[PDB]
Amino acid sequence: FRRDHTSDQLHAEFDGKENEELEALNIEVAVAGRMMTRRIMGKASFVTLQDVGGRIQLYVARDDLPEGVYNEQFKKWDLGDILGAKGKLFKTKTGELSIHCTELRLLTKA
Numbered sequence: 001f002r003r004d005h006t007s008d009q010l011h012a013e014f015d016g017k018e019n020e021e022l023e024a025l026n027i028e029v030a031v032a033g034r035m036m037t038r039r040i041m042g043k044a045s046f047v048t049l050q051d052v053g054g055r056i057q058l059y060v061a062r063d064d065l066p067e068g069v070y071n072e073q074f075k076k077w078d079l080g081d082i083l084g085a086k087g088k089l090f091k092t093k094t095g096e097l098s099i100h101c102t103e104l105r106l107l108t109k110a
Helices: 009-014 019-025 071-076
Strands: 034-038 045-051 054-060 083-090 098-106
Touching: 009 019, 034 071, 045 071, 054 083, 071 098
Parallel strands: 054 098
Antiparallel strands: 034 045, 045 054, 083 098
């Protein structure tokens, strides 16, 4: 449960089946590491983070409880210090690959 955590087998699968399903099996991949690229609109944002050697894009959506634990917590993450976060994988362009950030589990210092 790291950045764009796990799930390879996944990808093999996600790439070709139904939602319902995708869900049943669903992965809540993450974002660990650190960044700052948001597209705010007050609350629920779309974000982009970095990890060891590259980035992933997510969806920080607090559709129901329009928090700060969110993109703001994110606003707070830095350098050495690291994230452990999660979002499900969902239909961005083809039906796979982006994270739908819902739980942000921040760190300790590295």
